Paper text:
We first tried to measure a direct interaction between the polymerase subunit E9 and a monomeric mutant of D4, D4KEK, which carries the mutations I197K, V200E and L204K. This mutant does not form dimers in solution as wild-type D4 does. We chose the KEK mutant as we were concerned that the artefactual dimerization of wt D4 in absence of A20 might interfere with the binding studies. The D4KEK structure, which could be determined at a resolution of 1.32 Å, is virtually undistinguishable from wild-type D4, except the dimerization site. As the mutations are distant from the interaction site with E9 they should not interfere with binding. Using BioLayer interferometry (BLI), it was neither possible to observe an interaction between E9 and D4KEK nor between E9 and wild-type D4. We conclude that binding of D4 to E9 in the absence of DNA is too weak to be observed without A20 acting as a linker suggesting that the D4 and E9 interact only transiently.
Author numbering: 1 to 218
The structure:
C-alpha cells in the first residue's frame, strides 16, 4: 500500500500499487472538485469514498458496476449491505442462488469473490439523492473506469438507462454487458441472464470463470 495527500477531506488516500498510474491525476482532479462534493452530507462518508482503491487489480477479470452508492448507508464497498437489507444485494444474491444452486445462506458480498471488482461509477451521492454527484465525479469516474478496464476482461453494468452509452467513457473495446438494474419494473432483473453470460464470455476468452458462490455469507 501507499498513501497520498489531498487538500480536502478525507485528506489522505491509501491505495494498492496497481492504482499508482492514475493517482497523480486523481489527486489533481479531486483537489479541483471536492468542494462541491463536501457541500453535502454524503453516502458514503468522505473517509470511505476511496476504500476500494486498496483492492488489487492484477487478479481481476470482471468488474460489476452500478452507477453510484446506495443513497443511504453506503459503506464505501459497492453493493455492500452488512445487515443484508438493501434490495439490490438481496436480488443479486437470489440470482446467484438460482445460478449456483446454493439455497442456504445469510448474506452476500461481491467484494469477497476472487476475480471480481465491484464498482460504483460515481463514488458519492448527496445523502438520499441518487446521481446527485454525477457532474462532479465525471472526470474521475472516467479515469478510474478506464484504469479498471485495462485489467478486467468483462465489464457488467447494472442499469440500462444509466449505462446505455458507457462505451463512450472507455478507451478500449473491452467486452461490456449492460443489464437491468435490480429494481427494474416487471421483475426484469430476476429473468436477466447477465450473471450467467459473464462466465460464458470469460470461457470464450480462455479465462477462468467466476465462482459466484464465493460471495455468500454463511
Amino acid at each position: 500500500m501507499n498513501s497520498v495527500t489531498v487538500s480536502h477531506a478525507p485528506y489522505t488516500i491509501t491505495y494498492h500499487d496497481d492504482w499508482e498510474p492514475v493517482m497523480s491525476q486523481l489527486v489533481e482532479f479531486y483537489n479541483e472538485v471536492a468542494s462541491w462534493l463536501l457541500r453535502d452530507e454524503t453516502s458514503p462518508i468522505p473517509d470511505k469514498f476511496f476504500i476500494q482503491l486498496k483492492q488489487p487489480l492484477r487478479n481481476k477479470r470482471v468488474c460489476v458496476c452500478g452507477i453510484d452508492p446506495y443513497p443511504k448507508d453506503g459503506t464505501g464497498v459497492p453493493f455492500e449491505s452488512p445487515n443484508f437489507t438493501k434490495k439490490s444485494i438481496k436480488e443479486i444474491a437470489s440470482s446467484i442462488s438460482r445460478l449456483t444452486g446454493v439455497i442456504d445462506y445469510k448474506g452476500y458480498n461481491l467484494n469477497i469473490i476472487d476475480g471480481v471488482i465491484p464498482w460504483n461509477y460515481y463514488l458519492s451521492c448527496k445523502l438520499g439523492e441518487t446521481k446527485s454527484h454525477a457532474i462532479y465525479w465525471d472526470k474521475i469516474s472516467k479515469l478510474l473506469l478506464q484504469h479498471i478496464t485495462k485489467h478486467v476482461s468483462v465489464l457488467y453494468c447494472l442499469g440500462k438507462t444509466d449505462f446505455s452509452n458507457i462505451r463512450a467513457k472507455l478507451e478500449s473495446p473491452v467486452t461490456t454487458i449492460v443489464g437491468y438494474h435490480p429494481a427494474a419494473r416487471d421483475r426484469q432483473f430476476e429473468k436477466d441472464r447477465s450473471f450467467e453470460k459473464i462466465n460464458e464470455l470469460l470461457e470464450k476468452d480462455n479465462k477462468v470463470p467466476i465462482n459466484w458462490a464465493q460471495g455468500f455469507i454463511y
